[PDB]
């Protein structure tokens, strides 16, 4: 029945990715004195399906100057990573329990950029290359601290396994102990997904659509899920990382309800941030992080290695 589990972790997510679009439209609208989609079915609950069919029956544009083989690999690579990087998440009991969960988290998160990379190159245009290279610049500043914050926070968890995160957070939230890191992790998770103040790669007002300029119909529709499935999964990563809920050993219902609510609350804040602030500049973004973020990471990581030894509070390895 393991295959049934695989679809049960894919299809329910896919509808969750679908309804994030409708929720974002309504959340953004109601934060705008607007109403949001409410004509497609009741309360606009049919809107994602309305856009769903249109895109997959939309004319999938093939640009002549594009390199076709690389053109099609990028949407496949973007979506494939998005789903497969859900599998180590410890929703009560993780689907794929591995001793190095967070390392696998970073690996496919780092693999994700090659979607916007190859697509940006294959589109063969000015706005295509501008978006792809600033996508390098946005993400080049990005893995260096993402690993450090992950290392510093987990250093008192005990290991890289995602399941044991719950045992560490059994008594109090992780955010109580590393709130300076949590704010900094949250900005980066807001940043790794190219969202809200850091959306240079898309840049509607300044790059029309960036990498997505020559991407229509399903090839576009695929790009939307990869972006939005990464939003939910990264927030779920933050929810377990910093706000690990209680887990009854006999009723996984309790953790599942609490964990999902935490992901919903965090994902709304992603839309909350997306509505409020303006958009940075890709030079300021890099300057913000390698001049202000990265120096704080090293000292905070310095603090979070010295702290367990000085307090005789090192965590068990097994």
């Amino acid at each position: 029945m393991f295959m049934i589990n695989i679809l049960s972790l894919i299809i329910p997510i896919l509808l969750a990715v679908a309804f994030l679009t409708l929720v974002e439209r309504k959340v953004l609208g109601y934060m705008q004195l607007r109403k949001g989609p409410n004509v497609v079915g009741p309360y606009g609950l049919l809107q994602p399906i309305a856009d769903a069919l249109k895109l997959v029956t939309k004319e999938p544009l093939r640009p002549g100057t594009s390199s076709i083989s690389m053109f099609i690999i990028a949407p496949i690579l973007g979506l494939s990573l998005a789903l497969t990087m859900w599998v180590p998440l410890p929703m009560p009991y993780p689907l794929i329990n591995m001793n190095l969960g967070v390392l696998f988290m970073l690996a496919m998160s780092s693999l994700a950029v090659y979607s916007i990379l190859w697509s940006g190159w294959a589109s063969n245009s000015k706005y295509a290359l501008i978006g792809a290279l600033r996508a390098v610049a946005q993400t080049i500043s990005y893995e260096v601290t993402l690993a450090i914050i992950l290392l510093s926070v987990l250093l008192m968890n005990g290991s890289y396994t995602l399941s044991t995160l719950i045992t560490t957070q059994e008594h109090i939230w992780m955010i109580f102990t590393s709130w300076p890191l949590a704010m900094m992790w949250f900005i980066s998770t807001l940043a790794e997904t190219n969202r809200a103040p850091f959306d240079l790669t898309e840049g509607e007002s300044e790059l029309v659509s960036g990498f997505n300029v020559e991407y229509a119909a399903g090839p576009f529709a695929m790009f939307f899920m990869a972006e939005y499935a990464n939003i939910i999964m990264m927030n779920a990563f933050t929810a377990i990382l910093f706000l690990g809920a209680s887990h009854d050993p006999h009723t996984p219902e309790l953790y599942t309800i609490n964990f999902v609510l935490k992901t919903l609350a965090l994902t709304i804040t992603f839309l909350w941030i997306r509505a409020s602030y303006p958009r940075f500049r890709y030079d300021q973004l890099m300057h913000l992080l390698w001049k202000s973020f990265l120096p704080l990471t090293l000292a905070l990581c310095m603090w979070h290695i010295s702290l367990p030894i000085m307090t005789a509070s090192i965590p068990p390895q097994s």
Binding site: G64, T65, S66, S67, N124
Partner: protein
């Protein structure tokens, strides 16, 4: 039948017509997808004389204005006749796609045309279509042609990149007309 019902009905007899959405140049251009380019007996025994679309369009317009088009039967044909193999050589040279001709017996191509007819959408190649590619344009000099109307035929060599610029990859997209030499023409 139409001539019987309408005696003074000008009948226009165009040869194969090439243009942007022609399904004639695009037909051979699209043939690259299915491996090589299959021509029966290498297509070396089939001479075609295509005509550009606009000339026949101006032919119809001039025929309407002309007070002598009543009853006549015009045959709209191009300037030069090309053997089919050289024509496909010209097309793939203009598109710069590799040419991989290979012989194919007539009965087997008919079978291939049958398989393609199964599609419930716009067919790509029917058994009837396979026959047409084999049908060489019969010369009808007694039939009043195109120059009598006044329209001068445009050789396919001039306005060939229009149809085939789209089929070129990004590599040879900006290549001009003079890059590919004019194909040999078996003339009357």
């Amino acid at each position: 039948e139409v001539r019987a019902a309408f005696p003074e009905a000008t009948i226009i007899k165009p040869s194969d017509i090439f243009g942007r959405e022609d399904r004639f140049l695009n037909y051979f251009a699209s043939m690259r997808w299915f491996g090589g380019v299959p021509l029966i007996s290498l297509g070396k025994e089939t001479v075609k004389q295509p005509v550009y679309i606009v000339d026949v369009s101006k032919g119809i317009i001039n025929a309407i204005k002309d007070p002598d088009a009543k009853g006549k039967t015009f045959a709209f044909v191009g300037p030069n006749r090309y053997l089919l193999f050289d024509l496909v050589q010209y097309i793939f040279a203009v598109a710069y796609r590799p040419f991989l001709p290979y012989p194919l017996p007539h009965f087997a191509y008919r079978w291939v045309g049958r398989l393609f007819e199964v599609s419930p959408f716009e067919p790509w190649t029917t058994r009837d279509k396979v026959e047409r590619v084999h049908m060489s344009d019969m010369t009808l000099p007694h039939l009043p042609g195109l120059e009598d109307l006044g329209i001068q035929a445009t050789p396919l060599e001039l306005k060939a990149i229009e149809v085939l610029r789209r089929h070129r990859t990004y590599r040879w997209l900006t290549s001009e007309m003079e890059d590919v030499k004019p194909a040999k023409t078996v003339n009357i």
